[PDB]
Amino acid sequence: ERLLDELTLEGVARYMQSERCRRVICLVGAGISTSAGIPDPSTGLYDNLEKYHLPYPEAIFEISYFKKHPEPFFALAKELYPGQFKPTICHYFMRLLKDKGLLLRCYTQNIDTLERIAGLEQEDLVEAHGTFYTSHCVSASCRHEYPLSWMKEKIFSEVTPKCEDCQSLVKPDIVFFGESLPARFFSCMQSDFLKVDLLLVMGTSLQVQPFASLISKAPLSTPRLLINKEKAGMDFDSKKAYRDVAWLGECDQGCLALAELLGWKKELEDLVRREHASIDAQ
Ligand SMILES: [Zn+2]
């Protein structure tokens, strides 16, 4: 019955080498980007906003307030926006899955675009909270699109981004409070998990819905691995535990350990130093 030899990282790895493990879905959150300097989340973000004199601290990420007073959001973005965008070991572990024909999807809660920087393409990605990768004019008759290079220079230069056709405000394609999740999230979830062979859940405690409910959409036999600072969301320990495995610690170290067990570690670390060097050159 059990598709896993044993509820360990080793059994996951062995399963990953069986003929039956063809289709892998990654579900990732803020914990896969912390080691890249991206924040988030009781990290204190809403605790430092007095200088923006907001009606309430969360207004800085609320769509209706943003459309009226975009300047706090874009000043906050400049302040928090990292000096470089270098994907983590964990990001490049997921690119190996893509490169070996194992990645069905990466569903991500993150907006930092590191999955794309690491080499995942749009077909590979479900950006459940949207992304800074692209931005759009907020006027419904226009919706002119702007790339990250454009939005980045506007934020760094402290120039409120305005549309070059109609002068309306231009917003990054991230999901603000008051906005709905992208259609791509709900459409892809309808069938992606009907026949997935493994769920890899990394850097999320599965406290956020409807993203957390994705893990219950897989077949009951599909093994599920959690790489996270804390156990949550799965049956690791009861008398009925049969398919869920928890590795507790930082996402990067967990991916390195999984890589070693598959014989992927050399290939992975060689991808990291290489890609990080290209980024420093730019
Ligand atoms: Zn416009």
- 21 shares a domain with 150: no
In the reported structure, the alpha carbon of residue 67 is separated from the centroid of ligand 1 by a whole-number distance in angstroms of 14
Burial class (CB in 10 A: 0-12, 13-18, 19+), 67: middle
Query: Do 161 and 255 reside in the same domain of the chain?
Result: no
112 is in an annotated binding site: yes
Query: Does 93 share its domain with 209?
Result: yes
- Residue that terminates a domain, selected from 174, 199, 231: 174
Pair (137, 238) in one structural domain: no
Domain enclosing residue 257, as ranges? 9-37+87-129+182-281
d(CA 13, CA 8): 9
136 with 274, same domain: the answer is no
Residue 62, token pair as written in the block? 């609320």
Q: Is the domain of 139 the same as that of 211?
A: no
In contact, 196 and 24? CB cutoff 8 Å:
yes
Instruction: Resolution in Å, one decimal, please.
Output: 2.0
Let me know whether 103 and 221 are in one domain: yes
Is 88 annotated as contributing to ligand binding? no
Tokens encoding 152: 């980045």
Do 122 and 136 sit in the same domain of this protein? Answer: no
Q: Is 117 annotated as a binding residue?
A: no
Are 143 and 233 found together in one domain?
no
| Domain match, 64 and 145 both | yes
Identify which of 248, 243, 184 has the alpha carbon closest to the alpha carbon of residue 219.
Answer: 243
- Could you give the angle at the alpha carbon of 203 between the alpha carbons of 202 and 207, nearest 5°? 105
With DSSP H G I counted as helix, E B as strand and the rest as coil, what are the percentages for the chain, rounded to 5? 40, 15, 45
Active-site annotation holds for 53: no
Distance CA 45, CA 276 (A): 28
Q: Are residues 276 and 224 in the same domain?
A: yes
What is the Cα 60 distance to its own chain's centre? 21
Catalytic entry in 129, 136, 144, 276: 129
Q: Say whether both 136 and 115 belong to one domain.
A: no
Q: Is the peptide bond before 210 cis (omega within 30 degrees of 0)?
A: yes
Find tokens 């990645």 and name the residue. 103
Q: How far is it, in rounded angstroms, from Cα 102 to Cα 111?
A: 23
